[PDB]
Amino acid sequence: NELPIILLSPLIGGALAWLIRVKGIREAIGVVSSAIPLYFLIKLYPALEGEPIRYSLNVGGFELTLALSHISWIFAMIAAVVGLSAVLGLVSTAKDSNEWLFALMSLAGALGVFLANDFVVFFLSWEIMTFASFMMVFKYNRHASLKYFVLSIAGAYAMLLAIGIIYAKTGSLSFPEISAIFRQDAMTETLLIYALFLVAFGVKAGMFPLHVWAPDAYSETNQSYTAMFSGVLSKTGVYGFFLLYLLMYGKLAITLGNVRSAPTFGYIIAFLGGLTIMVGGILAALQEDIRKLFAYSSISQIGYILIGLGIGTPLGIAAATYHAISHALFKGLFFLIVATIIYRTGKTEFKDYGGLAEKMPITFAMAFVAILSLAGIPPMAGFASKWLIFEAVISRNLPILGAMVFFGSAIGFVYLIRFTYAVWFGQRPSDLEDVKDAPLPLAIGMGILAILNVIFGVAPGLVARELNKLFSNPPIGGTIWELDLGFGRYNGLLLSIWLVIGLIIAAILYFMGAGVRKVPVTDTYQSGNPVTMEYNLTIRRNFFLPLKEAMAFWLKMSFDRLYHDIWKAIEELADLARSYVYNGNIQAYAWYLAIILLILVAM
Amino acid sequence: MLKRVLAILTILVIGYWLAQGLADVPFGQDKMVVGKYYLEHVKEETGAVNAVTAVVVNYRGLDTLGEVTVLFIASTGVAALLWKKKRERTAKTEGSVVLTTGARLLFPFIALFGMYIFIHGHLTPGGGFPGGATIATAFLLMYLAFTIYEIPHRGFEVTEGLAGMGYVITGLIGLAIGGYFLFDWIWQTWGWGHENIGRLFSGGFIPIIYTLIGIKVGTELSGIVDNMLKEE
């Protein structure tokens, strides 16, 4: 009826934008093919309070019970808006017609995992999503692409192994009733299920054992595509771990005794998440590239969600989903703004551009919202999200884990200062005089994500009251403006207006005239000396050499080296089994036949 | 010494496994659970008092058909594996003259006798295949005692396919009623049928199918040795 149309609509949008390459209409009717799921989700938003919406479509003999819960709609709503804000910025920066076939197939994977209430719709949509993202990044630098594909197929297919075991041991396949039978045995084969499920969703997260696809797949690609590659294609790991909590929480806590007030499987996933925020922030520093810096950013904020959705059965999910919405909502804007600055200008490396914030002030202001949306700024959603994650830590006391996530907020602050310095301030080189402003279709996505950010940050609020009620009976007594925690408040009305009053009183002490004469940049301090235009005065080379030389022992042990070692070992074993078993010796195959006949003797 | 002795060990355990697996019966009587029906209903259901010629062409009727399929595929396989458009003999190195004249006069003595084998699958054992193979032997005697003896190929494999067609046209005109139904002794289709039951009026349907299959397998191996005795 009204539910399956939104799952075929980005698939049909990927389908339709392959034949229609006759005119300039592959942009227009192609982008509104992915713009109807917002109109269909908000049309079915008031029917969530009514008894739930489902559908079966028995296809392939399976069940495929799609159903939309109170929180799966929330992830699907950010799926629609982030997948929109990239795709109307994707009407440029394509230079081909073979883009819309996969970037719209990925959004139908994204709406599929979120609207997955069975499993045979879950793994199908997950595999479609993995393929579409791979084939998007499968245009250049094959070695970067195939590494992501092998890892994410290993995650998808280890999930197929785990679903094989949980379909064997129970007998039934249906995902709504399989939580009931885990309640039935809630009162030695299940420590494998959790660990294999964690590896199955450590491939689409920033988990420190397995995150090596991130500095390559979030690296070189269509950059306007990438706003959904972190904004919805990394939320699928978050929704995977949350679906694991919807499957069992108590059955995994009895077989695994708690190390502290936090459960030990939640402690393990949150400890790997805290290591993730550490390594993601630290590797975001010494990463001279415009997108390889942002790969570590995108997996830095995943560990926040996997710390909040680790420890704590009340308010832990209720704070981690909040940061999930917040982080994906602004990181869509960050990848949009980095796609704009990589399209309007030329090359990629930091030693190409600097001081490019006056030729495009729409870009500068829109990502000044996003700079405020990161690392904690009280009018914006960044501070609300980080504060909720820090609120979930102190309840069910954890001192060792609170340090690394707080260090993660510091190192989240640090790299953004590294980004906005040698890309946006300083002098400009003399090859950026041939540049223009931001185009309109990326700017609509920038404005959409900015107004959604400012209604997200100054008042949580609407989404907090949405995820509070009808799901895990209220931990927070929130209202339209305050948040009303059990022991904190976090107002948003009388925290932003004291900023804008404090900025007025700060402007009173500045806006006083008395000569505000502008000066050029090429004439500057330089220890009281003449400085010409051909002096590289803004620093653009690694920016963090004492930071690299402080932990010069910790960076000698990478994981990029180990996985290439283990794959080269498998690949040379592939050359080994080729020459051993498969000989030209006919009598070798006769001996193989005599050996297996001897096994048939042995019975 | 490692390979031979180790093979003797494994092949001794294979033979011991088969010999322990051969503990069914020490050559006893109790074997026919369906095989008694083949014997007690062979004198009145086909016509051939022979046991084996009625079971393999009438009862297991699609098994001499797979057999001639296998022999024809051996002919066309060796002919496809050896094809040079020249096809000359080796050096021909004559050697004797009581051999050429020896296989000269002896060539119709086997040609008379090989036909006698496949026409008689009624009181004599065998069938079409020993007679066809010794017709090929007579072809080999004239082929290994002369300096050329190239039977003309254009006009040789025509009758081989014609004889295989003659088998299958008895299956296809046998499809005028039912699966096989013999077309020859149970209904007066082209001639009579079931005169007595001896070697008279040729029993039922089994002799003419053996003339045709014996003609097919007669030109079978002769073609194989023909295109394998051809150098550049």
Added chain:
Amino acid sequence: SQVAALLIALPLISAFFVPVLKQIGKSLIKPFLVIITLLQTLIASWAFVQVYSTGKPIIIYAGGWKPPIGINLYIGHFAALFILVIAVVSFLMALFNFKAVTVEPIDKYAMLFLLLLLGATGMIATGDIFNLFVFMEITAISAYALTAYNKTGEAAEASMKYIVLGGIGSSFFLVGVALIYGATGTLNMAHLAMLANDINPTVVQVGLALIIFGLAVEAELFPLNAWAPDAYQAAPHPITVMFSAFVVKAGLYAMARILYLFKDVSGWSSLTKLLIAMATLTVVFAELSALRQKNVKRMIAYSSIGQVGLIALALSLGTQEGVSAGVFHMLNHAIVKTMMFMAIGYVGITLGGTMIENFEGLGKRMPLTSLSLTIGGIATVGVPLFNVFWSKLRIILAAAHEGNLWPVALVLFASVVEAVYYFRLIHTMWFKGKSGERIPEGAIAIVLLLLAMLIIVIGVYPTPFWNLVTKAGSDIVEVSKYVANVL
């Protein structure tokens, strides 16, 4: 009705009429093959719509002798489907080989091809264990003669190891037939399965083990396979399809037929626990020996063995939820491996050879034939909403209730490795080209692509085709409704 018994007789009469017209000229030799396999699709479609009309198979009799004393062709719900798909694949081969194999004496190649089609409709219609052996030897000597038909040294030896291995396997198979007959005394599988529960527990074990053994050698699992990624590498390009599409499926079905004909005896459980292990040992070795592979025909030859090994994985595990889904792989992998050896064949006949150095650069140089190899290589790992994705999901879910998590983590390991050697191939043909030579090839630009649109429709609509294999699993799942639909 026995009017549909022309699945064997019509290829037979046409293969005995083609050396009759080989001296009548040169023109109507190769066009004699296309009209007959079109008639083969017609006589297959008759049986296909007659089998799925009712719930009863056609007990094609071997004359006026009711089974078990005669031969019965139990053309079940399985058999009409597979005779149909081999008819349509052979008709796709006959309209391919008309202008792609004329280098060598096609004067006698047509009868060799059509006798392989005879062994096809004989092997997946057989009721007698004798007829099972005889039709398998027809297919075997067909393959002996036709993988050797290039005469180039490397292709001459490519048959040799197969002829000596298929000779030793057919030898062992006749010993196993002699032992099963040695206990029972009967041959027809209708009268065999009702009898083989208390014949002898120590005689049926060696006979069944050697029958499964000798029927496995002509097919492929682990020991008796390495002739096959020597046969696909060195053969005429159309028969590489008809071997990789068909001959693996008949062997794997007739192995999994007769294995589910004795599902009551002791020692059978260890036999299927061996067959699981050897099938898992062949999804790993075959689909990992293609990783450092240079010749691209070999790079697909190893892939076709690894797809049939996971067919063996679910064809002998349990009884259901995967045998009826194991057939869902056999009627599906034949189509996608028809696509593979079309594109490799068209490259090897247009450019020349199958080395990567003369395979590199087909994005702009070749037309959408390269897109057919693309959309085929996508569908072996089964990534999008495609058909091998549906089927491999059905097989991995089949390995749950019995033989779990070790015979999963090797077949499902291989699809991680098979993910590597396809996108090391699709990358070096689409995004490495640097060569704009147009080289028009619009004779298969539609026909392979209508085949390529046949895997896009089953990819979105499996439930019009998955309902077939539910009623087509009923020939292998059980014995009682099989036997009672014979006697």
